[PDB]
Structures are given as structure tokens and as C-alpha cells.
């Protein structure tokens, strides 16, 4: 009684994604995730001035270029042997933090929300699934359905301007966005002035107001209508985080700390235990067993028998692990926003102080959206603090020279999850450059041992009561905020 559903393109994600599911007895029973576009940045980078990498890598993705730039300049800082100043560190955090806000807002509204909100009857809001299970379908009181849908749609429209203001914030010290100019090996290229700090702050307060007063309330309200969506899209329940937004000059402390949670147990993150498999990916490895990124290889092969994706398969201690706001928020376990504490009580009858108080509900379609909204608020609190810490006039740049021979690794968290860039230099040129990106951890295919990637595994059990309108498949996938440009590079 199995039925196959194939969705290509899976739209309202970044980049080129195909999802295939098998459905039996009203639920997904198997799944395959495929990235269908490859550029090969790791090949393109070879032989270049290593400093060029922080411009080239941003073109992996125009949604999260600041994450790649951050990882690249940190890898360069490490390889070149240069220490960034206090003001350089803070300025880099302000550039990048502004895009965290942009990316999460862009995601929830402009990628995710059309699975819940009925837009106007003009393209690109139509056509849509005939039975889309939207707010206007779910809420049986018609006036309430209309009012809640309009509330959501007006936020979607307002968010177009809020995300644009976030890019004004990125450009303030970043030069422009997409694709900043302001982060380089040795720090940042423009010292913040008192006037520009104030101009960033004024814009930031408008974004922050939207986050607290509109975005958080919408998410908790949405979850209170779709309570079933906290009970599916579960997956492996293994998460990893690398640390993001260093809060001191020796990179020992972060806004969101590194860590791993596997099979119900917390452990420290050890980068030695990351490796990539390619058994079901369009790549050749020179040796079996999966490769640590420091000896990673990028030899594309679209003819490889049995392969189905351009995404490699990263594993931690041979376990699939997911990444992103759910991962970071689970690992750090921060206190919830005042809005979240209040609305969880009022709308759900849940007493919750810290993220982990959500329990099982965290590992679900709606849990991923909640984690992302809460993290947006948490990041805003941090940006508010950094705006007080930044010192007008204080040097943000330290000179360096390209080394003959060196290696460096930059670790961070992109808005979608754990990110590292590994850089090896020989004869003052890029000898190897290896990128292990966020969506790479989420949207990967099976490894050599047949273990499904996190999105593949989380699809198992997702209800599909209507095969012609399989709305929960896309809802699950989009809850991960996938970026296939990043996943494949």
C-alpha cells in the first residue's frame, strides 16, 4: 500500500533541493533528501592568495555570507598568527549578529510562513495546495481564522521591511550586503564611529521591537493552533554546536556555547571526531572510512553508482547530528524570553523557564520554529549589549603577512547551524580549503552504513493523510531552514 511522493523543486528553501518520501497508512515510512546543484568552491579556491577566500566563500550563499566570511577570516587569523583586537572582535559580532536577525526573520516569514498563512490571490502567493491546512482552514471560528490569518500576513509583509533594515545594519560596518567587505584577516576594515554606532542602534531598536512584540507572539500563537506539529518531525534527537559570538578576546566564552547532545547525553565538542562519508554522495574519496575535514577531498563524480546527492554526509562519532537554533538552544539551554514564558503558560498551560523545559516538544516541526524565534530574541539581547561595549575610535585592524606554510580553522555557527572552514597554506597559496557547513549536517544523504541524514530521519512518521496535499512534508523540511548552496558549495 506504499505511495511515492517526489517534490523537486522543494521551494521556499535556499537552493536546489529534492525530497522523496514513501507513504503508508497515512505516514511517511521512508525518505530521501537530494541536493542537485554543485559549484565546487573548494576546487575554485585552490592556488589563490589565502586572503581572497573571505570574499570568494561568501558567494557560497547570499543569505548567510557573513557566516562564511566569519569562518574564513577566523581560519585566516589562525593560519596567519594574528590576534584580533577587542574592538575588532566586537565589530565582527555586530556585522554578523545583524545578519542572524535578518536570516531568522527572512526564514520564518518569507520561507516558512506560507505553509500556514493564506496570502493574497496573486503570484507568487498562488497557486498553492488546494487543501493546504492553513490558519484559515484550521481555526473553525471564521472571524478568528480571518483575524489570525491577517495578523500573520501583515507580519509577513512588515517583515519585508524589517529584514531590509537588518541589512542596513550589516552594511553599517560591513560596507554592503549581501557580500560584506568589512571583515578581513586581522579584524575589521572600518572603525565604528559614535555616529554610526548610534545609527546602527536606532535601526536595531526597530528590529528588536518587531521581534518581541510581533514575531515571538506569532510563533507561540501559531504553535497553539498546530499543537500536533510539536508531536512530529522528530528525528535522531542528536545535536551539535561549535560556539558562536565570542564574548572575550581568547575565544573561550560565547553567547551560545559549543557542545554535543547524543542519545540523551551531553558531551563536549571535539573537532577530531567529525568526518564526512560519501557512499551515497556524488564524490570520490581516496580512502575508505570517511575523512576528517583536515584531509578532506573534493573530487566530484555525478556518475558514482548508488549516489543521490551532491551533499556529503558528516557524522560525529559515526552518529548523524542536526544543527541550527534547536541544536544551539538545546546545548546552551538559555532562559526563555519573557514572551515565551508568558505565552507557554497562557496558551498551552506549560510552565517553562529554560529552553529544555520544552522537553520532547523541542524536537519537532514547531519546536524548530520556536527555537529559531527564541534565538532571535536571545541574539537581540546580545546585540543590545554589544552596542554598549563597542568603543568608538578603537582600532579594529591588526596587520599580518601571508605565511609560506600554515594551517588554520575557523569555527562558528551560521544561522542554520555549525560551520567550520579549514585552510591549509603552502607557498603562500591555498593548498586545501574544506568547508563543513550547517545545512550539510541537516540535509545530507545516507552514510556508507545506511544511516539517514537528520531531515531524512525526521521525515519518518510525519503524517500525510492527503497524498495530493502532502503539506507536512514541506513543513518538516522548512522547519530546518535548509540552504543547499551552503550544503554543497
Amino acid at each position: 500500500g506504499k505511495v511515492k511522493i517526489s517534490i523537486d523543486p522543494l521551494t521556499r528553501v535556499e537552493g536546489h533541493l529534492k525530497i522523496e518520501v514513501e507513504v503508508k497508512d497515512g505516514k511517511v515510512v521512508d525518505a530521501k533528501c537530494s541536493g542537485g546543484m554543485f559549484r565546487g568552491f573548494e576546487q575554485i579556491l585552490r592556488g589563490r592568495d589565502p586572503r581572497d577566500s573571505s570574499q570568494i566563500v561568501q558567494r557560497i550563499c547570499g543569505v548567510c555570507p557573513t557566516a562564511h566570511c566569519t569562518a574564513s577570516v577566523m581560519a585566516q587569523d589562525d593560519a596567519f598568527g594574528v590576534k584580533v583586537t577587542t574592538n575588532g572582535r566586537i565589530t565582527r559580532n555586530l556585522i554578523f549578529g545583524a545578519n542572524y536577525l535578518q536570516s531568522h526573520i527572512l526564514h520564518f516569514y518569507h520561507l516558512a510562513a506560507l505553509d500556514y498563512v493564506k496570502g493574497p490571490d496573486v503570484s507568487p502567493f498562488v497557486p498553492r495546495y488546494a487543501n493546504a491546512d492553513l490558519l484559515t482552514d484550521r481555526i473553525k471560528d471564521g472571524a478568528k481564522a480571518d483575524a489570525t490569518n491577517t495578523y500573520g500576513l501583515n507580519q509577513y509583509l512588515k517583515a519585508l521591511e524589517i529584514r531590509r533594515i537588518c541589512h542596513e545594519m550589516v552594511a553599517m560596518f560591513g560596507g554592503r550586503m549581501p557580500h560584506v567587505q568589512g571583515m578581513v584577516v586581522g579584524g575589521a576594515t572600518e572603525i565604528p564611529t559614535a555616529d554610526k554606532v548610534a545609527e546602527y542602534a536606532a535601526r536595531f531598536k526597530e528590529v528588536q521591537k518587531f521581534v518581541i512584540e510581533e514575531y515571538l507572539p506569532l510563533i507561540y500563537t501559531l504553535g497553539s493552533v498546530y499543537t500536533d506539529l510539536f508531536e512530529t518531525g522528530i528525528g535522531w534527537k542528536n545535536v551539535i554546536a561549535f560556539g558562536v559570538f565570542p564574548e572575550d578576546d581568547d575565544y573561550k566564552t560565547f553567547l551560545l556555547k559549543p557542545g554535543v547532545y547524543i542519545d540523551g547525553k551531553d558531551e563536549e565538542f571535539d573537532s577530531k571526531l567529525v568526518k564526512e562519508y560519501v557512499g551515497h554522495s556524488f564524490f570520490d574519496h581516496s580512502a575508505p572510512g570517511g575523512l576528517h575535514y583536515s584531509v578532506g577531498e573534493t573530487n566530484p563524480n555525478p556518475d558514482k553508482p548508488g549516489a543521490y546527492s551532491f551533499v556529503k554526509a558528516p557524522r560525529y562519532k559515526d552518529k548523524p547530528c542536526e544543527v541550527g537554533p534547536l541544536a544551539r538552544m538545546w546545548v546552551q539551554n538559555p532562559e526563555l524570553s519573557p514572551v515565551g514564558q508568558k505565552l507557554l503558560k497562557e496558551l498551552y498551560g506549560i510552565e517553562a523557564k529554560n529552553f529544555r523545559d520544552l522537553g520532547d516538544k523541542a524536537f519537532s516541526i514547531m519546536g524548530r520554529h520556536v527555537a529559531r524565534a527564541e534565538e532571535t530574541w536571545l541574539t537581540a539581547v546580545a546585540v543590545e549589549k554589544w552596542l554598549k561595549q563597542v568603543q568608538p575610535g578603537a582600532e579594529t585592524y591588526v596587520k599580518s603577512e601571508i605565511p609560506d606554510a600554515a594551517e588554520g580553522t575557523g569555527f562558528t555557527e551560521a544561522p542554520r547551524g555549525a560551520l567550520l572552514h579549514y585552510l591549509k597554506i603552502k607557498d603562500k597559496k591555498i593548498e586545501n580549503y574544506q568547508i563543513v557547513s550547517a545545512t550539510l549536517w541537516n540535509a545530507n544523504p545516507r552514510d556508507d552504513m545506511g544511516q539517514r541524514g537528520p531531515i531524512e530521519e525526521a521525515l519518518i512518521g510525519v503524517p500525510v493523510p492527503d497524498i495530493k496535499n502532502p503539506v507536512n512534508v514541506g513543513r518538516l523540511v522548512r522547519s530546518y531552514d535548509p540552504x543547499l548552496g551552503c550544503a554543497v558549495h
Binding site: 517526489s6 522543494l10 592556488g47 547570499g62 518569507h110 554592503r176 549581501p178 578581513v184 585592524y397
Partner: protein, 279 residues
């Protein structure tokens, strides 16, 4: 009255051209989508997915044959029979599945279009995906049209990403021409098919640091005063109106902040590299 129909397709792109478009002002993106264009297909933002999305795209390309703009973001990879970019799957009338490559998609849609607009340096000129070291046979729209012997009006709007003003301005000028060709002639293009309206000015000739350049006052590092030439600035060899227009609603621009990397030019990135070595 009537909006410009747009089918926006992505090949080897990063979505940055789309994101830059979302940053438009005067008009902003809400007004663009509701009043200026009918964005019929766009993989990043459209409601429908899979079969429904593709069927809608092909329906519009038929109903609006010779009367829609094909917007292309990203390069077209030709190696391995186009298999480095699969843009969707079409389910025939018998249940069998067929993947569609970027090559196949562009070959199909370009002859149906009123005009093709290659937005971004990737689609216009090849850009980063076509740079040295790539193995995907990555190609620009103009080169793919030449190889395919496709004669279709083509306008390039380069930049990595292009400024939203360049994309909106070019599309509005094209649509105005279609609606009244003698009142609104097509924008004059340079030898690389990009509008002189936006790409006629040399950055360096129009740069506010030119007085410093002339006095040999060069910034020793990024955070010192002076012209940026010694830090790698490619303004001397780059043609765009960034010095006047600036970026992100006039907030900053590359040269004030750091250096121009020549992102609009047909030889970006290789002819502009290394970025932090002077020209």
C-alpha cells in the same frame, strides 16, 4: 496598469541576487511584487512546490509566450551533460520521472520569453562558479545562447550581487519599452550587454578619494586615512555607479568601508584577484 510577468530561475547561484532585490527601496519589494511585476515563478519565495510549481511555470511560459521576462540568477554548468545543476523533475503522463538540467530549462524558456535578463555576474559573465579551478563547465547566459544559437533579446545586469536599483531600473526600462517602444527606447548597452545607465561611470573617476589618490595619500592599512589603491582597490578598472548610489539605502559602500573588488566586471573574480593586492 499591467504588471511585467517574470519567471525567475536559478542555476549555479547563491540566491544573493534575489536577496539584494529584496533590499530595494523606492519602490520597496512589497510594491514591486504587488504593483510592478507579476513574479510568477521564483524558487525561493513562491507558495507552490514540485509538480505544481513547475506546471505553473510552464503554463505561464505558454499563456504569456513572447510576453514574459526570463530572469536568470546563477551560471549554467555544461559539463557532465548538465548534471551539475538539476532544477526540477517533470512527471510525464505515464508516471515516469525526468530530471531537468539548467541547460534544458534555459534552452526551453529563453525562446518563449519576451527578453532574458541575466541578473548578477554569474549569469551575465560566469563569475565565481566559472572561475579558475571549476570543473563544471560553468557558462554565462550570453555564452550559452551563443553555443545554442539562441537569438533572444538579452540584457545583462551584473554585480555580485547587483544593486537592487540596477535590477529594478533595468526591468522597468525594458517593460516601458515593450509598452511604448518609441517613447521609451531600450537603454543603450555597452559591449558586454550591460546598461550604460548604471555601468557607464568608472568608479575611480567618480571616487571621493580621487583627490587623495592624486596627492599620493594612500591608506597604509584599512583603518588609516587615504585612497585605498595600495590595499587592492579595483575602482580604476571597474564601471558602475556605486560611488554615487552607494549601498543598502545609502548606508555605506565598498570603497569607503574597504576596497572595490570589481564585482560587476566580466573578468570578476580572476581578473580582479588577488583582491588585496594593488592593480
Amino acid at each position: 496598469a499591467k504588471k511585467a510577468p517574470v519567471i525567475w530561475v536559478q542555476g549555479q547561484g547563491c540566491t544573493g541576487c534575489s536577496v539584494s532585490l529584496l533590499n530595494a527601496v523606492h519602490p520597496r519589494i512589497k510594491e514591486i511584487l504587488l504593483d510592478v511585476i507579476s513574479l510568477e515563478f521564483h524558487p525561493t519565495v513562491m507558495a507552490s512546490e514540485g509538480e505544481m510549481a513547475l506546471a505553473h511555470m510552464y503554463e505561464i511560459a505558454e499563456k504569456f509566450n513572447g510576453n514574459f521576462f526570463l530572469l536568470v540568477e546563477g551560471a549554467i554548468p555544461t559539463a557532465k551533460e548538465g548534471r551539475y545543476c538539476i532544477v526540477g523533475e517533470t512527471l510525464d503522463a505515464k508516471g515516469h520521472h525526468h530530471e531537468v538540467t539548467m541547460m534544458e530549462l534555459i534552452r526551453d524558456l529563453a525562446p518563449k520569453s519576451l527578453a532574458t535578463v541575466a541578473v548578477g555576474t554569474c549569469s551575465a559573465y560566469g563569475g565565481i562558479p566559472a572561475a579558475e579551478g571549476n570543473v563544471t563547465g560553468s557558462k554565462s547566459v550570453r555564452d550559452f545562447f551563443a553555443d545554442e544559437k539562441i537569438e533572444k533579446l538579452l540584457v545583462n545586469v551584473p554585480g555580485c550581487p547587483p544593486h537592487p536599483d540596477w535590477m529594478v531600473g533595468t526591468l522597468v526600462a525594458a517593460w516601458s519599452h515593450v509598452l511604448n517602444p518609441t517613447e521609451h527606447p531600450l537603454p543603450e548597452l555597452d559591449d558586454d550587454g550591460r546598461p550604460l545607465l548604471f555601468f557607464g561611470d568608472n568608479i575611480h573617476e567618480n571616487c571621493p578619494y580621487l583627490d587623495k589618490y592624486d596627492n599620493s595619500e594612500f591608506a597604509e592599512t584599512f583603518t588609516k586615512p587615504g585612497c585605498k589603491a595600495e590595499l587592492g582597490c579595483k575602482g580604476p578598472s571597474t564601471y558602475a555607479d556605486c560611488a554615487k548610489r552607494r549601498w543598502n539605502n545609502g548606508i555605506n559602500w565598498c570603497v569607503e568601508n574597504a576596497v572595490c573588488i570589481g564585482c560587476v566586471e566580466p573578468d570578476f573574480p580572476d581578473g580582479k584577484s588577488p583582491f588585496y593586492v594593488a592593480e
